[PDB]
């Protein structure tokens, strides 16, 4: 009888930076996808390995809701087999991804006149992220032969950068709130079912 708490994910006041993306496990609830259907603000709403129409007629062991904020032209990196600074260093989906990606423009919430410097992304990393891996380290990146010893300098760079979202940016550079729903079928029983399989 319990409904899945999609509202507290999609309609949260504050969203995580992509490098420190937020994950909420959704279990033991009825997945009413109608609220997701009827939100006419979604620029992106697509699924992989499953049709978004058949979500109310399916059951899963767990549904993982990952959320973060990136630029508009970076939303496409939140997809199987994609590359770029966000997919390589911040949030990586697997090539076998089963789930849905939802993104909507959030210029009205996450932009500030003079810049909102609270949203960050990782720019440097010695290796790409594994799927669903998170790196929240703040260690100086050694871009040259000389070791850094934690001191920023020549070929020694801080790994995070700030978006600095302003409302006057073009839509490509404007902030977009992203929610990735992952569909897991590992250890029975299934706990998240649509109202049509319930």
């Amino acid at each position, epitope marked *: 009888t319990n409904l899945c708490p999609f509202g507290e994910v999609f309609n949260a006041t504050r969203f995580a930076s992509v490098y420190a993306w937020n994950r909420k496990r959704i279990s033991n609830c009825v997945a009413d996808y109608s609220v997701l*259907y009827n939100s006419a603000s*979604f*620029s*992106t*709403f*697509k*699924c*992989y*390995g*499953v*049709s*978004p*129409t058949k979500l109310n007629d399916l059951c899963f062991t767990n549904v993982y809701a990952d959320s973060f904020v990136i630029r*508009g*032209d970076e*939303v*496409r990196q939140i*997809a*199987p*087999g*994609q590359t770029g600074k966000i997919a390589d260093y911040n949030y990586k989906l697997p*090539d*076998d*991804f089963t789930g849905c990606v939802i*993104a909507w423009n959030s210029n009205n919430l996450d932009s500030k006149v003079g810049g909102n410097y609270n949203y960050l992304y990782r720019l440097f990393r010695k290796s790409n992220l594994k799927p669903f891996e998170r790196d929240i380290s703040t260690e100086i990146y050694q871009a040259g032969s000389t070791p850094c010893n934690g001191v920023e300098g020549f070929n020694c760079y801080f790994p995070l950068q700030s978006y600095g979202f302003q409302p006057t940016n073009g*839509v490509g550079y404007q902030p*977009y709130r992203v929610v990735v729903l992952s569909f897991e079928l590992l250890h029975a029983p299934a706990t998240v079912c649509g109202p049509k399989k319930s």
Partner: nanobody
Amino acid sequence: QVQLQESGGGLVQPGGSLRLTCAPSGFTLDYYAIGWFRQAPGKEREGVSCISSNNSTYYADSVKGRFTISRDNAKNTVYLQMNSLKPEDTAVYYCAAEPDYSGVYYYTCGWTDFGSWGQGTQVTVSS
């Protein structure tokens, strides 16, 4: 990024039909998803119709009964048949492409789903 060229635009009477064509250059549309977008004078860019690499489709509500998107990977071409054209359909129509190695299934289709864009072709429906 990839090179995209549109064709089939023009001026047509209301109720008439047009067939937009998106031709890739320098690659094949096999792994790619293709979408059609339009921007009317004095308005924002809107998604019209999209097709996945698995041939699943998206249609905006305003074109649902009138437009049909199709894929021909052998001829390396995506078509947008546009029947029963109305004056509100007057806009510049853009083709868009995005790698889609797995099969994507759309509920909506927006500009945030594509990285490559064509120059566009003009569609005008006036009597």
